[PDB]
């Protein structure tokens, strides 16, 4: 239930500064063009609780069974404020299930 | 080289424009629904008093 | 350089400035919607609790 | 009542660009943090916008002026064909409405 | 997608088709010009030879 | 998503080829014109050294 | 002359695009490898062109018809401002000149 | 020669995209209006090119450096299968041929 593994997740990111989200599709997930990565405040219940999101691009020339490394760039204006709350990256499939949840971080 | 830089900045600008459009569309509609759910939840709390 | 080239430079520079101007508008909208949507999320959850806590009453 | 929206149709195609025409009467001085919002009819406060654009500050403004303006809402700023009524509203940087258009549906 | 995006897509697509159509004209002109200049150059050399071979004959 | 990138990429390439083609055409057509004049000037010096 | 050039000016700006207007009279059947060239006045053969463009085949050509055409010459097809006079000429795929305009200068 | 053409074949397919590899020795500083022409063997002056491309100024050039370059001649820049011999030649903006390749045929 981590079929998606976020990598190199800092403990904090500078507010309103461009960011890169690194994650790995394990063989156990078949990526879909309506999969997405959200920034979620810690304590989310459902996929509606996202802050902002970006579609996860379909890996080029995908092969079933492969392990695929990905990067999403989050613009500074997609990001929570320096509000003292903790956030995580989450991988949401087109069915709405969360299949990846990173370690928490703060915007500061 | 002027055309190269223009065509690259145009490229990256509109790759970002598409992501922003998808976000604005999701945020717009969901916020609208939240405002109504909030309006109807205060309706239930004040009618429970 | 030629006139053929400059008309496309100008065409490209026009659309670039027009999309970039739209991006500022989109950035300001996104900043407002995402923060206010966050607060509507928390306000909703606080309201749902007083519902459950008043049929608990 | 110090901002007049003009040529406001009773309907607008969803997901299609749109032009909001308004006039600043002498009763108002524009401010860079004035904005024009699309509101569901029946709103209560400025917090109930659907989307908004900042109102571009008229160039070479003279006090006592009467100035015509237009903002372009992209299609992706607009409500869907949801059967609801909306209007334009002019909000000042101080947070007061000063203009409200006739209503329209997105259909 | 969007109508904003679709209208820049359509415009850039028309800009592309026109320039490619220009490029086909250019290729045809370069083919004829480069062949003909070469033939002119050999004709000039074959003619300048006949002026020094006529001025000592 | 490819379509934004693909027509930008095809635009870049086909217009960098166009700059080279314009410079060649301008060069080739000016010099071919001068050549045409020099060749006809030569044929006149050739016929008027025979037809006397 | 089976091909009539139309609206030929007395001069054209160097390095500026250009529209060459011409009419196919009933007397000529257009061939896909006919072409329009810019020629310096004084030309002897079709070989004397400055630059040229293939004449496009009119869509749905009808025997007996009269067909108005337009070719766009880009500025870099054009002679410089060199004090010489030029004309358009229509060259058939056999190599016969079957239409020659009034002369013009580039300046 | 101060320019060295590398990996040049004894022949190239007519009307096939081609790549011309050369090397700027320390002995020359590249200039933007330097150029690489295809010449028919036996040329006399720089006027005898067949076609030509400007040599692209290498970015962040360092004096004394050794810089390798590639130019892509499109198929429609090349001579036909005419039985003749050609070579690449590097011509400086001062008009001097400072590099000249081994010969090839287009066949």
Swiss-Prot record, chain A:
It comes from the Eukaryota. It is found in: Cytoplasm; Mitochondrion; Preautophagosomal structure; Cytoplasmic vesicle, Autophagosome. Expressed in all tissues tested. Transmembrane segments: none annotated. Changing residue 101 to Q: Complete loss of TBK1 and RB1CC1 binding. Signal peptide: none annotated. Disulfide bonds: none annotated. Ubiquitin-binding adapter that participates in inflammatory, antiviral and innate immune processes as well as selective autophagy regulation. Plays a key role in the negative regulation of NF-kappa-B and IRF3 signalings by acting as an adapter for the ubiquitin-editing enzyme A20/TNFAIP3 to bind and inactivate its substrates. Disrupts the interactions between the E3 ubiquitin ligase TRAF3 and TBK1/IKBKE to attenuate 'Lys63'-linked polyubiquitination of TBK1 and thereby IFN-beta production. The C-terminal UBZ-type zinc fingers function as ubiquitin-binding domains. This is Tax1-binding protein 1. It comes from Homo sapiens. The chain holds residues 14 to 121 of 789 of the full protein.
Swiss-Prot record, chain B:
The lineage of its organism: Eukaryota, Metazoa, Chordata, Craniata, Vertebrata. The chain holds residues 1345 to 1393 of 1594 of the full protein. The FFAT motif is involved in the interaction with MOSPD2, VAPA and VAPB and its phosphorylation regulates these interactions. It comes from the Eukaryota. Part of a complex consisting of ATG13/KIAA0652, ULK1 and RB1CC1. This complex associates with ATG101. Interacts with PTK2/FAK1 and PTK2B/PYK2. Interacts with GABARAP and GABARAPL1. Interacts with ATG16L1; the interaction is required for ULK1 complex-dependent autophagy. Interacts with RNF111, SKI and SMAD7. Interacts with COP1 in the cytoplasm of proliferating cells in response to UV stimulation. Interacts with TP53. Interacts with C9orf72. Interacts with WDR45B. Interacts with ATG13; this interaction is increased in the absence of TMEM39A. Interacts with WIPI2. Interacts with TAX1BP1. This is RB1-inducible coiled-coil protein 1. Probably involved in the tumorigenesis of breast cancer. RB1CC1 is frequently mutated in breast cancer and shows characteristics of a classical tumor suppressor gene. Belongs to the ATG17 family. The modification Phosphoserine is found at residue 26. It comes from Homo sapiens (Human). Disulfide bonds: none annotated. Expression levels correlated closely with those of RB1 in cancer cell lines as well as in various normal human tissues. Abundantly expressed in human musculoskeletal and cultured osteosarcoma cells.
Swiss-Prot record, chains D, G, H:
It is found in: Cytoplasm; Mitochondrion; Preautophagosomal structure; Cytoplasmic vesicle, Autophagosome. Expressed in all tissues tested. Changing residue 100 to Q: Complete loss of TBK1 and RB1CC1 binding. Phosphorylated in the C-terminal region by CHUK/IKKA leading to NF-kappa-B signaling down-regulation. It comes from the Eukaryota. The C-terminal UBZ-type zinc fingers function as ubiquitin-binding domains. Ubiquitin-binding adapter that participates in inflammatory, antiviral and innate immune processes as well as selective autophagy regulation. Plays a key role in the negative regulation of NF-kappa-B and IRF3 signalings by acting as an adapter for the ubiquitin-editing enzyme A20/TNFAIP3 to bind and inactivate its substrates. Disrupts the interactions between the E3 ubiquitin ligase TRAF3 and TBK1/IKBKE to attenuate 'Lys63'-linked polyubiquitination of TBK1 and thereby IFN-beta production. This is Tax1-binding protein 1. The chain holds residues 15 to 121 of 789 of the full protein.
Swiss-Prot record, chain F:
The modification Phosphoserine is found at residue 27. Transmembrane segments: none annotated. It is found in: Nucleus; Cytoplasm; Cytoplasm, Cytosol; Preautophagosomal structure. It comes from the Eukaryota. Expression levels correlated closely with those of RB1 in cancer cell lines as well as in various normal human tissues. Abundantly expressed in human musculoskeletal and cultured osteosarcoma cells. Probably involved in the tumorigenesis of breast cancer. RB1CC1 is frequently mutated in breast cancer and shows characteristics of a classical tumor suppressor gene. Part of a complex consisting of ATG13/KIAA0652, ULK1 and RB1CC1. This complex associates with ATG101. Interacts with PTK2/FAK1 and PTK2B/PYK2. Interacts with GABARAP and GABARAPL1. Interacts with ATG16L1; the interaction is required for ULK1 complex-dependent autophagy. Interacts with RNF111, SKI and SMAD7. Interacts with COP1 in the cytoplasm of proliferating cells in response to UV stimulation. Interacts with TP53. Interacts with C9orf72. Interacts with WDR45B. Interacts with ATG13; this interaction is increased in the absence of TMEM39A. Interacts with WIPI2. Interacts with TAX1BP1. The FFAT motif is involved in the interaction with MOSPD2, VAPA and VAPB and its phosphorylation regulates these interactions. Belongs to the ATG17 family. This is RB1-inducible coiled-coil protein 1. It comes from Homo sapiens (Human).
């Amino acid at each position: 239930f981590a079929h998606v593994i976020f990598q190199n997740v800092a403990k904090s990111y500078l507010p309103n500064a461009h960011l890169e989200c690194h994650y790995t599709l394990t063989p156990y997930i078949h990526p879909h063009p309506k999969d997405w990565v959200g920034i979620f405040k810690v304590g989310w219940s459902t996929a509606r609780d996202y802050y902002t999101f970006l579609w996860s691009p379909m890996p080029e020339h995908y092969v079933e069974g492969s392990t695929v490394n990905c990067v999403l760039a989050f613009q500074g204006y997609y990001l929570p404020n320096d509000d003292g709350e903790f956030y995580q990256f989450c991988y949401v499939t087109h069915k709405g299930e969360i299949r990846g949840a990173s370690t928490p971080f703060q915007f500061r | 080289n002027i055309i190269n830089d223009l065509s690259d900045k145009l490229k990256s600008t509109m790759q970002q424009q598409e992501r922003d459009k998808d976000l604005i569309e999701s945020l717009s509609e969901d916020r609208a629904r939240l405002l109504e759910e909030k309006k109807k939840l205060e309706e239930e709390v004040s009618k429970l008093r």
